Structure formats: structure tokens, C-alpha cells
Amino acid sequence: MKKRLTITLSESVLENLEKMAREMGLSKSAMISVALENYKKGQER
Amino acid sequence: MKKRLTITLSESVLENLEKMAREMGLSKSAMISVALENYKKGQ
Ligand SMILES: [Cl-]
Ligand SMILES: [Cl-]
Prior knowledge:
The PDB classes it as gene regulation. Keywords: transcriptional repressor, plasmid. 2 copies of one chain form a homodimer. By secondary structure, the first copy, chain A, is α+β, with helices and mostly antiparallel strands. Chain A contains 2 helices and 1 strand. The first copy, chain A, has helices at 11-24, 28-43; one strand spanning 2-10. The first copy, chain A, starts with a strand and ends with a helix. Bound molecules: chloride ion (2 copies). One chloride ion (CL) binds next to helix 2 of chain B.
């Protein structure tokens, strides 16, 4: 299913997250998902 | 400077998140922070 969870971010990281998500027209959850998969592919299979 | 945020992940992304975090000895929060800075960088 969908899974709900609460994370803690520094204010700077959260502000950049919002900015990036808004620039891409994504929710922050979707922006984090893209970031996680980009990182995963960028180092590992 | 710490702030909370609730997010929704698919189970598949959450499992990849938990594996990566365990690998690196990081909380989910810290692993997401790493991945976000890598992504921000990637331009
Ligand atoms: Cl959002
Ligand atoms: Cl966490």
C-alpha cells in the first residue's frame, strides 16, 4: 500500500526540498522518491 | 533548525529507503537528507 511516515529535516534541507518540489511540480513525497531512486541508481544496482 | 514533515511513500520506495539507510548506518531522515543533497547537486 501507501505508507505514511514522519521524518525530521534541518530547516535548510526542508526549504530546498520545497523549492525543488515546486520547481518540478511534484509533491515533496514524490520529490523525495525521485531523489532516493536517483541516489540508488547513481551508486548501486 | 530541526523540523518534522509527514510524507507518503509507496512500499517499494520505502523498502529501498530502509535498505540504503541500514547499509549506511543512517536513520531514514538522514538517508533522505543525503539523497536530497545528491539530487540538488546533480545539475
Ligand atoms: Cl508537498
Ligand atoms: Cl528517521
